[PDB]
Amino acid sequence: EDGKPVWAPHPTDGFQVGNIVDIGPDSLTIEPLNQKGKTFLALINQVFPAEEDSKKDVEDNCSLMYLNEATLLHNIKVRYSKDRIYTYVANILIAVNPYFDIPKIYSSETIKSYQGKSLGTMPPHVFAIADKAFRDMKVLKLSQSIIVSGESGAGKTENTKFVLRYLTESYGTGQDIDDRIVEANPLLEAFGNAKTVRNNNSSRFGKFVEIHFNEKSSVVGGFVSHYLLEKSRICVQGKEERNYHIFYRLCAGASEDIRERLHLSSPDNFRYLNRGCTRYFANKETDKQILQNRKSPEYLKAGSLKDPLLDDHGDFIRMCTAMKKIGLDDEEKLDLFRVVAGVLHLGNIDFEEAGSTSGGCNLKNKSTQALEYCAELLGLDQDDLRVSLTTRVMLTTAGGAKGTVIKVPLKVEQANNARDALAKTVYSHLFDHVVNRVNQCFPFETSSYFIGVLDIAGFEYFEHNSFEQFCINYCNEKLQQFFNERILKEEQELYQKEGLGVNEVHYVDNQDCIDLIEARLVGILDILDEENRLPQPSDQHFTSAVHQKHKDHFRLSIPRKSKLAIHRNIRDDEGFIIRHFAGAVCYETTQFVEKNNDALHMSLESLICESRDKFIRELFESSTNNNKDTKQKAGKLSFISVGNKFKTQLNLLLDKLRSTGASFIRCIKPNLKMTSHHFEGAQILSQLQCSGMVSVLDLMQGGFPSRASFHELYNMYKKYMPDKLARLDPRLFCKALFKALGLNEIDYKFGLTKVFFRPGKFAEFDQIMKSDPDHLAELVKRVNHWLICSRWKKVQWCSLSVIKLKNKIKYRAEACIKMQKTIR
């Protein structure tokens, strides 16, 4: 602005108040308020205009005169300190987790309060999002989807319970679907959740809870769709991380009878567990309940993993209690555990080079127990599994030429991949089964529409990033195109309903970034598939190929061109940086080709499909009838990489989203310690960036990001007007004030219910009201005739309106009292 205070970076609060004392090429120098002297530099695009009153809050962030990341953070902060956890940005909701039971807002009297009442007429609340989706569902006859973001501990679970409980109490005959999903949650969390570096209890799949409605818009049932389960976690993890929870819960809580049947041990004894963290979650009490013959060497040395709610022993018992309460019996519980056990042993199978007989490989002697246990548990024969893990089968032809089958010995690395490929198919099919069994609790034969809450792992970047970060960030880049498209459409529809003008809005589209990754033949994904076809597949060749096919691309740059110094020694063929919506992310391409293969050859595919064990056949007995549909078509889809398989499944997610009106909730996590009344500014700011909130605040600057209803502008400025104008109703107050001042027509627009402003013009308006009281007083004197005329016509045309509605009642009732052609 010009001497007025600003917001600038701060390591622990995100932004702090300061003044611009000097200027520079790419940096301002800011002098704090609190330090009154300790000056620091800060990039220009990192400091922002701040509000005049630092003690005001607003229910919609568009009421603010400047709308950026810094003012948003400070608005929700003041509201958080009054217990007002909800705050809009347009139709978007922001729900900071209080970490305590806020009285009266989830009452029965509050649910009634929000029924019918549109978004903006009531205070910000999750109930209002729920009701907007219902209202749009029945009127536009369109399925809806509320997309919620936020890491673990952000309140997504509480938020989804609030939706389901609002929609059944308001628009449902009884209906206890919210209570069966929560009772069934511990079961999904076992097979679906896992410990990441940043979050102990973290969902590694896109869950889409959905309430289904009949033709008359009434709850008939429920459904839980699942997308993009992380397959790579199944076979290997980094240190500080773990496999899926089911493995450790079972290794801690199972009885000693079960432990002998499945031949379980401490997780350091299994390949699929031991490269990552081997410790159980336990407090002082639950550590006593676990036998010593389950604890790994590292659990004995370093001790337990701590968490306020996760406990592997306690969660095995809570999972068992789940199985009962849904419907699963004792036979089907041991079944799930037999396949999990069968996956663990499979991993322990190793290989060694042969005697150059088309030099394949053979099973090691130490790994004979591995094969024996794995095979009994997966219902496979020992010998047939030894042959399939070490040899493929191929035709002698490819075209329409006749060709007999042959046996091709696999190499060591080829056999490792097969072993892992079978492990990830088996676990996946087992996960699809658990989810399907949850759905059989609240089934429904037929349905018209649905309202679904959707949460999937958000955008993230660490010091070192690889193929796992690439896929999550690719999933979120496409989800941010959807977000940004729907907010743009919501804005363009709001300016037309209000009647502002043609006013076009500038919009930096992110399609060029999504094209960088998923374009056919030239995107990174197909260049990575192309490397799998060269005689010597290298990760360096893949990376060099990427840089060449995109010479001066806006989103691709070499690692050396990173603003950080940790990527200063990465060569050009050892990585690339992607300019995602939320930020630059230096990827390291090492191992990228390996992570792009999980293909299971058919001979071994057919072995598990036709297992002796009825349950394991039933995991692919959907696949007995669905291969029967494909089989030839299903063998052609086994040639796809994990990259292109990721794209395809992600595109089914987006098509489901595309055919539905979308609302958005942005669940925020105020701190890492799970405690109430502690707003960690920097952590919330980082959340706002990765959730794509900041990207949306850039978008709305293109349009009219500042708006205040007439009643809002009346409460602010009536005190500066004369007593005659203060008596007016808010709409006439604003009409007189807008005309008096004589504002530019392209900057300020008088809409239907609200006054809209271009970037930094609400501020310009506000200075006209306070900088020159004598000038303003004269401009109001000058419009006094127009106001007397305006008030005349208001009441004159209102009286003619009542007479015209009197004439409508008679005119209509003349044809409905001249209907007598029928009666007699």
Binding site: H711, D729, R731, T753, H785, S799, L800, I803, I809
Partner: protein, 145 residues
């Protein structure tokens, strides 16, 4: 079809129906304005004419719907008879003039707060010939503006 200048004047009159400022009304709100200006429709007749324009089905009228809700196949003289009937709602005792007292009563009935001195100020601007009262001829010149 109405004029652009005729739409603007009904838009400001629509603000007296829509007091809270949400851009929308029900029969509880549009009913209370009707009752305030001498009319007395029952809670039933207005339900049928809401049901013409309301395409969404819910019970809420936006402005463009409100315009076609009162628009009808009109006779040549009907337009002028309505303008005269408006004047007569303003003129209670009925002698072709609107006094300060008579204008103040319609104002308060529609929900407009203002002093007695402010009321006289209005009457004075509309009053062309200068007898401190608004005849029909002058009532229409203000309406048109």
């Amino acid at each position: 079809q109405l004029t652009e200048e005729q739409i603007a004047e009904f838009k400001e009159a629509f603000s007296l129906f829509d007091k809270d400022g949400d851009g929308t009304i029900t029969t509880k709100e549009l009913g209370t304005v009707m009752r305030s200006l001498g009319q007395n429709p029952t809670e039933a007749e207005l339900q049928d004419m809401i049901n013409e324009v309301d395409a969404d089905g819910n019970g809420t009228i936006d402005f463009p719907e409100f315009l076609t809700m009162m628009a009808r196949k009109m006779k040549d003289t009907d337009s002028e008879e309505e303008i005269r009937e408006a004047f007569r709602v303003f003129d209670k005792d009925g002698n072709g003039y609107i006094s300060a007292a008579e204008l103040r009563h319609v104002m308060t009935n529609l929900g407009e707060k203002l002093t007695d001195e402010e009321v006289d100020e209005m009457i004075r601007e509309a009053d062309i010939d200068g007898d401190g009262q608004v005849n029909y001829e002058e009532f229409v010149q203000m309406m048109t503006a």
